[model samples]
Target: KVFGRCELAAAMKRHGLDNYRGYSLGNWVCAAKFESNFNTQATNRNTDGSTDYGILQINSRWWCNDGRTPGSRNLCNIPCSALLSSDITASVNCAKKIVSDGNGMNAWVAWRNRCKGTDVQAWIRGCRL
Candidate 1:
């Protein structure tokens, strides 16, 4: 499913992204814009041959088991396919796990390149949450 910006922002907020690891909701929302454009089924392949899955683009190389990524860590203990579902609870939890592992929001190149040093508050400005 593709989410509207507000829908995604509220959803992420409810998932506990607010001030998560010192990053604001806007930071996460802005990164999601560049990462997957709010599509639940978004996927991308990495240069190292692993794939990024879901809205947040969870990496198969370290966070999920895609059954084919080389040296997969499966840190989230979930199938990469699970990330593509409409229910994003698993995906959100995986992202939380990632940040909690000392990676911060810098794990995703999309966040680092596009959201790292910017004013992201606008990303959640119109949201009711």
Candidate 2:
């Protein structure tokens, strides 16, 4: 099931912060853009698509294999499509897990750290989800 932008966006919206509000959608968008250029069909062969996926650009294999649901092909043993299914929360939960155990927050911290010298609030507040 190859998905384009609109289907990808719908899938992302389904799994995005609007439903759970656990984190900022803006932050997710930033991460997605930074990681995979917001391409749902994006694939990195060098790492066998392990780098990122969907709007959140989640790296399921690097993070965990549990969240991936059935009917998903193991794109490098990762549910890369499920990463873009109509489950926004799946991505959010995946993102949270990646950042959990003090694993991935350093990137966020790095971004936030850069804000210290500048207008930090602007970076967080003006950011679009």
Candidate 3:
């Protein structure tokens, strides 16, 4: 989903992630903005030999598979390609599961390395919702 900032916020709001797992909507918004720029098709090859996928950059180390790679933990049990679709339901569901498993937004490096302690209000600044 290639969304502008407000569109991203509206989408997340419609998805009911405003305060999922005690994290604020701004956190998730910041995460998506930094992790993939709201591009659901985003994928990145990490130096650690794991690949990140989709808007949240879920890692193949424990999340999803590239279909050609072996030894992925695949905790999400969905194809990594599934996350690349414009429909963000699968990715969102998996992210929720990841946070629910006690990792919080800390599971995402973008959150810890950038969004944490930052004034993420800019991410939702003009979004009325």
Winner by lDDT = 1
lDDT of 1 by residue, 27-81 (tens): 8888888999989899999899999999999999899999889777999999999
TM-score of 1: 0.96
Candidate 2, residue 79: the lDDT equals 55
For candidate 3, the lDDT comes to: 0.87
**Arrange candidates by lDDT, highest first: which order?**
1, 3, 2
Least accurate 10 contiguous residues by lDDT in model 2:
114-123
Better of 1 and 2 by lDDT: 1
Worst 10 residues of 3 by lDDT: 64-73
Record all residue pairs in model 3 with backbone atoms less than 3 Å apart, i.e. clashing. Answer: none
Model 3, residue 24: C-alpha shift (Å): 1.0
lDDT of each: 0.90, 0.46, 0.87
Candidate 2's C-alpha lDDT? 0.46
